[PDB]
Amino acid sequence: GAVTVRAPGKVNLYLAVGDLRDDGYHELTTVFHAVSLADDVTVRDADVLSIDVVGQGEGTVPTDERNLAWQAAELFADHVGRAPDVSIFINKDIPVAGGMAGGSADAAAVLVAMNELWHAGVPRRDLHHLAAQLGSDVPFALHGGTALGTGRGEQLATVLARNVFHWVFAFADGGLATPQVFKEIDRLRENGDPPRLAEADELLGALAAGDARRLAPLLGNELQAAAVSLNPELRRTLRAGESAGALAGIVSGSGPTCAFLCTSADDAVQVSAELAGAGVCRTVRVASGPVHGAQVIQG
Numbered sequence: 035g036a037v038t039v040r041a042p043g044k045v046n047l048y049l050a051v052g053d054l055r056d057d058g059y060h061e062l063t064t065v066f067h068a069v070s071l072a073d074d075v076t077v078r079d080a081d082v083l084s085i086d087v088v089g090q091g092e093g094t095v096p097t098d099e100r101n102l103a104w105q106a107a108e109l110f111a112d113h114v115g116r117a118p119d120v121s122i123f124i125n126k127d128i129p130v131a132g133g134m135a136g137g138s139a140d141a142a143a144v145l146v147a148m149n150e151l152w153h154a155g156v157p158r159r160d161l162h163h164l165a166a167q168l169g170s171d172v173p174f175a176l177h178g179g180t181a182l183g184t185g186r187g188e189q190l191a192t193v194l195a196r197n198v199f200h201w202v203f204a205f206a207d208g209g210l211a212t213p214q215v216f217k218e219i220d221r222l223r224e225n226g227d228p229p230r231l232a233e234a235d236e237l238l239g240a241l242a243a244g245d246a247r248r249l250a251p252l253l254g255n256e257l258q259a260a261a262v263s264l265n266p267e268l269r270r271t272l273r274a275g276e277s278a279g280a281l282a283g284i285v286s287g288s289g290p291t292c293a294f295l296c297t298s299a300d301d302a303v304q305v306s307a308e309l310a311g312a313g314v315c316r317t318v319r320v321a322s323g324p325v326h327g328a329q330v331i332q333g
């Protein structure tokens with residue numbers, strides 16, 4: 035009578051940030067990529083709504099209405115005309131406030147788990163609409179694979195990533211608040227005329243060719259300059275992973291996690307070991323993508 039759903043962390047292979055909109059979000063164009071660093075969420079019927087967390091953020095992560103999974107349970111229950119009487123257990127590998135949208139993964143997982151738990155038969159298009167109400171990254175956590183995100187990031191068009199791509203992720207000592215990083219890119223742009231990414235075409239071509247070596251120099255994230263402004267030590271992490279043999283390093287999302295694309299699974303084993311020995315980040319992970327979006331794995 036429990037349903038467990040796995041939802042992936044993401045890395046933005048490409049992230050162009052536009053103007054601040056009326057709604058307080060920035061317009062953006064991104065290429066989301068789902069990776070095997072995931073959260074597992076177990077949902078059970080219960081007498082009241084509750085959340086518990088182990089893994090990343092075990093000491094740390096709020097379990098009240100601050101948690102996006104709370105709001106996901108309330109929203110889904112309301113959609114289907116029921117009370118959100120479910121216990122939610124989150125076993126987290128996605129770093130907290132790390133740029134990989136772990137709270138969004140958890141919220142996506144709750145939608146899918148409650149759908150199955152209750153056999154509510156709510157369709158993908160409707161789960162997508164609910165996800166978009168919860169946050170800009172929640173729809174991608176439902177969708178998974180690799181996708182072109184537009185609008186605020188909630189509008190998705192699937193793209194082909196025609197291989198397995200091999201990653202090392204370097205978790206930082208702390209976290210960054212996503213709104214501070216967007217404020218900082220705005221500040222940097224008020225001040226100067228920093229470089230903007232080219233169009234996504236070439237990067238999308240490299241993905242469709244399945245070619246990590248071609249993809250690597252095309253990766254780019256316009257928030258990286260903001261994350262590095264706030265946390266300049268991330269330059270040491272980027273430099274270390276690259277020197278260890280990564281094809282490329284980029285900050286993931288709003289940071290401060292650093293992502294390193296490698297040529298093969300064996301290459302990532304080597305890069306992760308060298309990076310762990312370098313003394314420049316908190317802890318290191320190996321992963322691959324693309325992986326599926328939020329999916330039931332038990333129950």
Ligand SMILES: Nc1ccn([C@@H]2O[C@H](COP(=O)(O)O)[C@@H](O)[C@H]2O)c(=O)n1
Pocket residue numbers: 058059060061062168169170171185186187212213216
């Ligand atoms: N497209 C986006 C997405 C997020 N943001 C910033 O990040 C914050 C968190 O966004 P989400 O709640 O959608 O995750 C927003 O309140 C906003 O400050 C943005 O400015 N533009």
